[PDB]
Design a protein around this ligand. Structure first.
Ligand SMILES: N[C@@H](CCCCNO)C(=O)O
Ligand SMILES: N[C@@H](CCCCNO)C(=O)O
Ligand SMILES: [Fe+3]
Ligand SMILES: [Fe+3]
Ligand SMILES: [Fe+3]
Ligand SMILES: [Fe+3]
Lengths: 337, 337
């Protein structure tokens, strides 16, 4: 028995009674889990590229179920016993592979107090090549065309369209100072109550401006872009990944202003529609504030409450930096060719 | 093999390697699932009261893991394959029992348009005895002592302390009008950015005022109060229960002002601490606004988008009304004796 995205599409087409029968059959469920371990081995031991893409296509479909409004025809289907077992197996393998790129020295010599930890982490971020990647520093300002931006925005659908729900998942159960900062960030994402200013709405306008339609996205989404989006989903939805999420999305907010300023300036130079760049233009100042509040009110209080979490925050920051590097190197490699 | 709360406490004490070994053993996992079906049968077929309380003690512990900040020692433990299978089995039985009390005529003759559906649902709510329950209408204004209120507030820890995260879970993936209303409600719950005004913080002050400490809660929490809190958790955390949640928490907001006005007036008459009633006092006007916005901006747009969801919203409203009735009848029965 082999598992791939089409096998899971078939599961999601089952009616509520068929799901109940599957959930009651632990032999069928053992076989599904074994098929996931086999796929995980092809993807990360053999490092077969088609198995790696298949694995992230499967995870992406499962997270679609976690993040999307359920359709009426599926409201009676108990998908958690099977889908959560699949996700646990594939996630475990994705994260073990990320951790293989992270050394213990990288995540252990931090200062064990909040304000000092923030300075250390900014330095650690600044050492990493993703903090000044040539896609943004070099290619965008000098070469990027409308078709380049269209391809780039297709990759960016991996994360930006669900950022408000990432934050909503993250703040579940969070301590007060951290929760209040994440909550204010989420409220900004929802336009502070004004529909026109909702961030996902303005990002959708950028997609419209370059005709980044769903078929173009499906055909052009890079495997490393899918991995990036799956890592974001993986970390946000589990309480036990909260402190990794703190580092992962802290790095994200921190790097947006430098990256988006480059995108916005080029977008203007080549005369692309002003209406389409409102999202990126707005985030240049918004995420300078978000990044400042995230360090001061999420990271520093967490470390001050329990310095042991500085190691988890550092791992999440490095997972974001490493996965962003692989994604941007792959993107820049496809855009050159 | 029997499953109870202490068996699941033991699972949660396992280290990450022991969890990995358990997750890989589908024979052990088949036995856990079979033990859950056996407990479910004792609880809802035999209707054994100790099995029913044990079942909700198990669910409550699992939802604690979904809703609480994870402790550092547990960050490496993959609990989803087993805990989600347990929850699916016990939840399926809890909800089947709720649906046994709901007739098809109750959830099918609604008008298939939003504004009209709102009037229908308010009428349906008004027919149900929980909408004017004697605990609030009769006992509170005339008899409730400080010890009665202390016992009551212990029961209310089933829901109020996690209402902000219920809303955050609920709005995941929601359509824009509905999402923006839920988001504004959540932001109100977080004091609109002012820590002193965060609703869970002010509820904690009410608990402090009557010494509703964790040991008192543990010893006094009624089985129907646990069932109420578990139903709230169950519906909020699954995307497929979104439309039930819309009805369940819509009824909740709608009934708060009448109930809390009775509580606040009695609390004053018997001279209890003014500082302790700030939460309930504030919610009298807050939830009149929340209830109005919930009907207008959540329920009516959902029904207008797809009238089929009026049946799910109605089921969730009746689950809230029925479970509130059982809880308040049990509470009033213990307070009389
Ligand atoms: N996709 C962009 C950042 C996305 C942040 C979302 N803003 O709320 C990047 O990778 O830098
Ligand atoms: N526990 C109360 C309502 C709780 C609503 C929370 N307010 O944000 C009741 O059962 O009426
Ligand atoms: Fe944003
Ligand atoms: Fe931001
Ligand atoms: Fe509230
Ligand atoms: Fe409210």
């Amino acid at each position: 028995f082999k598992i791939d995205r089409s096998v899971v599409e078939e599961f999601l087409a089952l009616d509520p009674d068929a799901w109940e029968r599957l959930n009651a059959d632990y032999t069928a469920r053992r076989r599904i889990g074994e098929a996931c371990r086999a796929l995980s081995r092809h993807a990360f031991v053999e490092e077969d590229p088609s198995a790696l893409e298949e694995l992230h296509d499967v995870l992406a479909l499962i997270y679609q179920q976690d993040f999307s409004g359920a359709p009426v025809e599926l409201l009676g289907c108990e998908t958690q016993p099977v889908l959560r077992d699949i996700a646990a197996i594939l996630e475990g393998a994705v994260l073990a592979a990320e951790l293989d790129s992270i050394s213990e020295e990288q995540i252990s010599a931090y200062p064990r107090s909040g304000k000092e930890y923030v300075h250390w982490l900014k330095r650690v971020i600044g050492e990493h090549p993703a903090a000044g990647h040539p896609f943004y520093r070099d290619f965008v300002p000098t070469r990027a065309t409308e078709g380049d931006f269209r391809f780039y925005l297709a990759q960016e659908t991996n994360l930006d369209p669900k950022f408000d729900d990432i934050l909503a998942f993250m703040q579940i159960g969070a301590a007060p100072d951290e929760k209040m900062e994440i909550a204010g960030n989420y409220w900004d994402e929802m336009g502070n109550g004004k529909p026109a200013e909702v961030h996902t709405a303005m990002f959708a306008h950028a997609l419209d401006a370059l005709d980044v339609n769903d078929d173009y996205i499906r055909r052009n989404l890079l495997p490393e872009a899918k991995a990036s989006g799956n890592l974001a989903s993986c970390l946000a939805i589990s309480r036990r990944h909260y402190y990794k999420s703190v580092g992962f999305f802290g790095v994200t907010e921190y790097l947006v202003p430098r990256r988006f300023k480059l995108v916005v300036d080029r977008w203007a130079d080549i005369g692309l529609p002003r209406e389409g760049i409102a999202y990126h233009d707005a985030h240049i100042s918004i995420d300078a504030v978000h990044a400042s509040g995230w360090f001061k009110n999420v990271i520093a209080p967490a470390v001050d409450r329990d310095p042991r979490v500085g190691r988890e925050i550092a791992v999440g920051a490095l997972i974001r930096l490493n996965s962003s590097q692989r994604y941007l190197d792959s993107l820049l490699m496809h855009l050159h060719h």
